Paper text:
Exo-β-mannosidases, hydrolysing non-reducing terminal β-d-mannopyranosidic linkages, are widely distributed carbohydrate-degrading enzymes. We show that these probes covalently label exo-β-mannosidases from GH families 2, 5, and 164.
CmMan5A showed 20% inhibition with both 1 and 2, and stronger 85% inhibition with 3, indicating that binding is enhanced by the presence of the alkyl group. CmMan5A bound to compound 3 gave the highest resolution structure at 1.3 Å. Supporting our hypothesized mechanism of reactivity, compound 3 was covalently linked to E330, the known catalytic nucleophile, through its pseudoanomeric carbon. The ring was found in an OS2-like conformation, providing the first direct evidence that the GEI conformation for GH5 β-mannosidases matches that of GH2 β-mannosidases and GH26 β-mannanases. The amine group from the opened aziridine is found interacting with both the general acid, E215, and an apparent buffer acetate that also interacts with the axial O3. C7 (taking the place of endocyclic oxygen) forms a CH/π interaction (3.4 Å) with W285 while the alkyl chain extends out of the catalytic pocket, forming hydrophobic packing interactions with W285, W135, and a hydrophobic groove between N288 and W289. We speculate that these interactions contribute to the observed tighter binding of compound 3 over compound 2. Indeed, the first four carbons of the alkyl linker display well-localised electron density (B factors of 16–25 Å2), indicating rigid binding and suggesting that a shorter linker may hinder binding into the active site pocket.
Residue numbers in the entry: 23 to 431
Write the structure that this text describes.
């Protein structure tokens, strides 16, 4: 019983399936059997998530070893081809745990950004030069150009396909299931937020990006003809603000469904220090972004998942006891509009909040993750508490539970 696509919606055993999800990048890490893992916590997190109506996690499948202090440590890939089999047993365990609970997972295999190593880490290994952490340089245009250089590197593509092959052809070491046979996996996903480059991307670079999405999705389908494939794109914003790049990249049959993300604070629509003043304008831009991507989903006749979206705590606090009124009202507005869209038969096929902190805790004064600290939905490139929902965020969890039930057929 795999998750399938039929037009603008997902089906499971021929019944509509709607994604009522969270991002939990570290869920497979939690499954590791060694000191990196926390299997007791993983079971408790999944129990709590299931109790609040979550059916789907979006999870990082692979990381690349990094020496920067904005990235997960340890890594799955300790230089090209040097995979940590003990950490892969954590993915095996996560898949067993999700199956017990009738939850699914979307697994992404790379990262535009630095927090799992990702595309810039590929390039650093190839060139024998260290990664420039954009949290240190504040040189984001240069970072995005460097990350997109990955698509043009034949060596990087060979290693990336090596990595896709290593996971897709895996046998679950616990239950013996081939990954290609495991219905717990909803989708393979090319990367987290792949973009074509920076704001100065050329027409040739846009075409390289489009061709990369097509060829990578085709390659996965050679290994696995039946799991869904998605890109992990943010949408228009992840397409150098060119909706035609989004359309062209995702028009291939091998992309089964569409993704979009929304980052109203990172995109400068919302100012976390002036929330009352900036929310009205930010909400106008968000509702327009949602309609623009629902309209593209109708044109391509594919489901659309808002698989990553979040908002700061009130006044940008990282503290657990800070209020989340702006986040909660944003989530309400998104869920109201998306539920209306689903009622009207449009390809709105659900969501994954960014992100789930659950029982994870920091005791770092500066909220900055260090190796050995609890993993949170906020990865190591962001303060622990920036975007994640803690178990104690009662107001937010009530909204999630309410709408998770309303979105279920």
């Amino acid at each position: 019983h795999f998750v399938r696509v039929n037009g603008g919606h997902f089906e499971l055993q021929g019944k509509p399936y709607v994604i009522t999800g969270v991002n939990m990048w570290y869920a497979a890490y939690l499954g590791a059997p060694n000191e990196v893992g926390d299997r007791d916590r993983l079971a408790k997190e999944l129990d709590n998530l299931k109790a609040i109506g979550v059916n789907n996690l979006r999870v990082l499948a692979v990381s690349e070893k990094s020496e920067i202090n904005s990235a997960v440590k340890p890594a799955v890939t300790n230089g090209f081809g040097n995979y940590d089999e003990t950490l892969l047993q954590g993915l095996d365990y996560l898949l067993v745990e999700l199956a017990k609970r009738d939850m699914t997972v979307v697994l992404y295999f790379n990262n535009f950004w630095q927090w799992s190593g990702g595309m810039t880490q590929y390039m650093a290994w190839i060139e024998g030069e260290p990664v420039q952490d954009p949290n240190v340089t504040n040189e984001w245009e240069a970072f995005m150009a460097k990350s997109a250089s990955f698509y043009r590197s034949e060596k990087a593509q060979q290693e990336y396909r090596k990595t896709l092959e290593k996971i897709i052809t895996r046998v679950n070491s616990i239950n013996g299931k081939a990954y290609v046979d495991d219905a717990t996996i909803m989708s393979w996903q090319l990367a987290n937020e792949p973009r074509p480059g920076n704001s100065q991307t050329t027409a040739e670079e846009k075409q390289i990006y489009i061709d990369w999405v097509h060829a990578a999705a085709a390659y996965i389908k050679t290994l696995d003809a039946h799991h869904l494939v998605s890109s992990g794109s943010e949408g228009e914003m992840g397409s150098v603000n060119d909706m035609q790049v989004f359309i062209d990249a995702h028009a291939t049959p091998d992309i089964d469904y569409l993704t979009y993300h929304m980052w109203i604070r990172n995109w400068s629509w919302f100012d976390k220090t002036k929330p009352a003043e900036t929310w009205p304008s930010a909400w106008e831009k968000a509702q327009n972004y949602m309609r623009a991507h629902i309209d593209v989903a109708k044109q391509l006749n594919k489901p659309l998942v808002l698989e990553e979206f979040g908002l700061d705590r009130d006044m940008g606090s990282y503290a657990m006891d800070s209020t989340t009124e702006y986040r909660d009202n944003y989530f309400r507005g998104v869920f109201e509009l998306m539920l209306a869209s689903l009622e009207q038969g449009e390809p709105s096929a659900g969501y994954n909040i960014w992100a789930w902190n659950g029982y994870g805790r920091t005791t770092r004064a500066n909220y900055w993750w260090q190796e050995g600290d609890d993993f949170m939905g906020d990865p190591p490139q962001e303060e622990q508490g920036m975007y994640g929902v803690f178990d104690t965020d009662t107001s937010t969890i009530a909204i999630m539970k309410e709408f998770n039930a309303r979105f279920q057929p």
